[PDB]
Design a protein around this ligand. Structure first.
Ligand SMILES: CC(C)[C@H](NC(=O)[C@H](C)NC(=O)OCc1ccccc1)C(=O)N[C@@H](Cc1ccccc1)[C@@H](O)[C@H](O)[C@H](Cc1ccccc1)NC(=O)[C@@H](NC(=O)[C@H](C)NC(=O)OCc1ccccc1)C(C)C
Ligand SMILES: C[C@H]1CCCC[C@@H]1O
Ligand SMILES: [K+]
Ligand SMILES: [K+]
Lengths: 99, 99
């Protein structure tokens, strides 16, 4: 699909059974979701942005569906106000910027 | 151009005759540049990111060139760690996400 940028690029995702809304974010290195439980072990990580840093939990090899496109990669979980799909998963679904 | 996302989408921009590196960022409503000097009057704005909120200076009707594409619009200036080209300007240059 082609997604214009007049409004926030919000899409439906599926992860761990649940359907969520997330932002397709070319300015995020990593994918960060609001608090939830995921399978497997985790390790702490600090991530930074506008306003400073937050502590998140890192889960690896997580399956995700983004607009019906499946992908696998690292997912971070923590106190983010918005679900963020970062470049680590954007590449897997074949997402590019075009102008 | 078509920009893939294996690396950060960092491009050259030009503002006030100066070249800078900036991040093409679909997860940013607004364009926010690192501390610098612009002409004209500014008004206050607060913007939130992953780590909390920052205070920035809002300048309107600013000339900025993004990868050779001219845009004229709102530019915020403040304590961002990176120059960010947000949706307000991505739309002007005709940028879309595609997969
Ligand atoms: C999501 C993170 C993994 C991502 N960071 C990174 O990729 C990494 C690894 N960090 C990294 O390189 O950090 C360098 C650094 C160094 C020192 C200090 C701080 C940071 C990130 O924050 N990326 C942002 C850009 C950026 C990149 C590097 C460094 C600094 C900023 C945007 O792409 C991005 O998408 C965020 C996501 C977001 C959206 C909405 C809310 C919160 C977060 N949007 C933004 O930060 C923009 N905000 C917005 O568009 C607005 C208006 N926010 C908003 O709605 O705020 C609601 C809010 C409510 C309550 C609390 C906080 C916010 C901002 C650039 C203009
Ligand atoms: C298995 C888990 C990962 C994404 C697709 C469906 C589900 O929620
Ligand atoms: K386009
Ligand atoms: K594509």
């Amino acid at each position: 699909p082609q997604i214009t940028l007049w409004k926030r690029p919000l899409v439906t995702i599926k992860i761990g059974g649940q359907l969520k809304e997330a932002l397709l974010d070319t300015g995020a290195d990593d994918t960060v979701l609001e608090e939830m439980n995921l399978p497997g072990r985790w390790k702490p990580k600090m991530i930074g942005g506008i306003g400073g840093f937050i502590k998140v939990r890192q889960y690896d090899q997580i399956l995700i569906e983004i607009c019906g496109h499946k992908a696998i990669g690292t997912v971070l979980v923590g106190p983010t106000p918005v679900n963020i799909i970062g470049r680590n998963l954007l590449t897997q679904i074949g997402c590019t910027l075009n102008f």
